[PDB]
Design a protein around this ligand. Structure first.
Ligand SMILES: NC(=O)c1ccc[n+]([C@@H]2O[C@H](COP(=O)([O-])OP(=O)(O)OC[C@H]3O[C@@H](n4cnc5c(N)ncnc54)[C@H](O)[C@@H]3O)[C@@H](O)[C@H]2O)c1
Ligand SMILES: NC(=O)c1ccc[n+]([C@@H]2O[C@H](COP(=O)([O-])OP(=O)(O)OC[C@H]3O[C@@H](n4cnc5c(N)ncnc54)[C@H](O)[C@@H]3O)[C@@H](O)[C@H]2O)c1
Ligand SMILES: CCCCCCCCCCCCOCCOCCOCCOCCOCCOCCOCCOCCO
Ligand SMILES: Cc1ccc(S(=O)(=O)c2cc(C)cc(S(=O)(=O)Nc3ccc(C(=O)O)cc3)c2C)cc1
Ligand SMILES: Cc1ccc(S(=O)(=O)c2cc(C)cc(S(=O)(=O)Nc3ccc(C(=O)O)cc3)c2C)cc1
Lengths: 283, 283
């Protein structure tokens, strides 16, 4: 039953996870400057996107804000002006491929070539698979993953030429494990994780060392995106603090909280029937 | 998170003794209505013959009219007259129209093997946006429409089997296949979510299986040297998994250990691997 092999792999995962916390704590990493960088933040009209925007504004980055909610993106750009940075706000629908391209040409003309992309815009329609609407399933994929492909394909050429860039994919713990009443959302978030993992490998194979990639995978955050969790509740400030620390230290996989990867790692040692029961309990 | 880390460990070692250290029963698929997508070649074609040998009622789907007809002809030689159809699994409306025809002519599908898949190998900047959309429409979106249509009958009877044919690319991203890996990650996520949702809905008699093989010699991608897998081995692992209700079927089975040892891949080995990846891309 590969029991000896599996006990040794369990101990290695545990020892490695322990050493990973030690290094995180005792060996502090150098943290880069994002000042002057052209930062595009999608879904910047609320929550994680709005707070992330303010962290870049504080660090004197050049900002390009995108969101479908015209009032929200304008409200974020107004607070950026108070923080000392005049942001370039646009109301762009990240589900639309043509709209993304048209708006990125406007960004090239008015602002310049984007250097850091935070693909934060996302959508969810909680329901059991048989109660879902097919239009909503398509929309979940168009925003949560297909939009990432079109924004990256458009901005990547300049980053490749310069061997300098940063692609931030905002995925979720739902990109690592599936949960009830969120099947299309988990599937689209798994695709976002896969996009980041593949992009990271391809840039490495192409020798584009200077183009960094980061993937944000937080647990339930109190932003109104969803009203209640599936399996503590995070505050937006903690997530943004972890995201900025990860971007500046070129962290590839940013779990929020950092230790949730221990749970995810240990679950790989369980049958799927057991892990599914596990993520459905409330003791 | 101390307490949950411990409940995970006690849970791991509990299932190590439950069925990991304990006369395996294999079910009968005779008389079952089996739908196999992408049945005109490779894995789908061989899987079809295994169900025909086990006296299952067969419904075959493929875009390639000649290939699906060739498979249905060999089924007749095996003793089963199959119902072959030319259906494009990327088209939501075509899937629904064809499934109404299957309901009228054959009946309610009991086992679904979502095997049809597509790939357009290229580095992200050389990909065609139509091909990126097509990769998602076939590899993941088609799984959603086929399942939503066939699931109600399986729910009513508490009996069924949803087989998701994903790939090792659903567990790790590889260069020059970013949209393909992203769509395969979504397929894995769909299976994981479906498994949890069925458990939450109390419909566990609808079993789920996810096939994740390494490179198979079927012509899906061109051959590069590196060990190659044969279609017969994959189909043998798939059938054994379906009959024994295996949820995660890696081919070969031990590639789950390889995925777990990725953090330990020596820098020298990564340099050779991402050197053969481009040596074969150039072909
Ligand atoms: N909230 C959580 O619990 C949670 C957890 C993990 C991951 N995430 C992810 O974090 C990201 C941000 O979510 P949030 O928690 O800040 O939610 P939020 O509701 O506060 O903000 C999301 C923003 O994205 C915008 N947006 C949605 N669709 C868009 C589109 N088509 N084009 C442009 N903008 C669009 C919305 O209008 C909104 O301003 C999402 O990708 C979400 O999946 C959220
Ligand atoms: N070949 C491998 O190396 C490999 C490895 C892991 C996983 N897989 C997966 O296994 C599955 C089967 O691939 P294969 O290796 O048997 O390849 P294959 O080329 O031999 O056969 C795939 C079949 O799917 C059909 N198909 C493609 N698009 C379709 C559509 N829109 N509608 C209906 N049918 C369609 C094709 O006509 C073909 O007959 C795919 O999902 C693939 O991603 C393949
Ligand atoms: C602190 C650490 C302790 C140090 C001591 C180390 C001792 C030895 C350790 C051994 C570790 C071995 O682990 C290997 C894990 O590998 C898993 C990596 O998975 C990543 C996926 O990448 C695989 C890519 O495949 C490479 C081959 O590419 C060619 C494939 O050709 C076939 C397909 O061709 C068509 C594709 O287009
Ligand atoms: C006991 C235990 C079980 C699971 C985990 S986990 O970190 O693997 C985990 C996995 C998912 C899968 C969801 C959640 S959740 O409860 O936070 N639920 C949500 C997570 C994300 C989202 C979203 O992105 O909208 C909406 C709910 C969490 C904590 C940690 C500890
Ligand atoms: C040294 C080493 C490295 C990786 C592995 S692995 O088993 O984790 C692995 C991971 C992926 C990620 C791909 C592959 S691959 O080389 O088989 N590549 C392909 C896999 C699937 C497909 C396809 O689905 O078409 C097309 C190529 C493999 C062996 C085992 C040993």
């Amino acid at each position: 039953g590969n029991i000896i092999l599996e006990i040794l792999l369990l101990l290695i995962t545990i020892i490695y996870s322990y050493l990973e916390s030690l290094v995180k704590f005792f060996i502090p990493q150098r943290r880069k400057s994002v000042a002057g960088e052209i930062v595009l933040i999608t879904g910047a009209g609320h929550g994680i996107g709005r707070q992330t925007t303010y962290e870049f504004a504080k660090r004197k980055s050049r900002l390009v804000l995108w969101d479908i909610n015209k009032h929200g993106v304008e409200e974020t750009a107004a607070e950026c002006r108070k923080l000392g940075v005049t942001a370039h706000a646009y109301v762009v629908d990240c589900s639309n491929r043509e709209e993304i391209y048209r708006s990125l040409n406007q960004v090239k003309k008015e602002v310049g070539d984007v250097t850091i992309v935070v693909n934060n815009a996302g959508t969810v329609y909680p329901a059991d698979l048989l109660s879902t609407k097919d239009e909503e399933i398509t929309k979940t994929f168009e925003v949560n993953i297909l939009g990432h492909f079109w924004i990256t394909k458009a901005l990547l050429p300049s980053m490749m030429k310069r061997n300098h860039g940063h692609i931030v994919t905002v995925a979720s713990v739902c990109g690592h494990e599936g949960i009830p009443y969120l099947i299309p959302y988990c599937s689209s978030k798994f695709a976002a994780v896969g996009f980041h993992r593949g992009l990271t490998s391809e840039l490495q194979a192409l020798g584009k060392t200077g183009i960094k990639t980061s993937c944000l995978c937080p647990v339930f955050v109190n932003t109104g995106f969803t009203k209640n969790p599936s399996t503590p509740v995070l505050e937006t400030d903690e997530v943004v603090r972890s995201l900025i620390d990860g971007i500046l230290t070129n962290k590839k996989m940013i779990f929020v909280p950092s230790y949730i990867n221990i749970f995810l790692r240990l679950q790989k040692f369980l049958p799927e029937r057991a892990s599914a029961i596990l993520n459905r309990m409330q003791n």
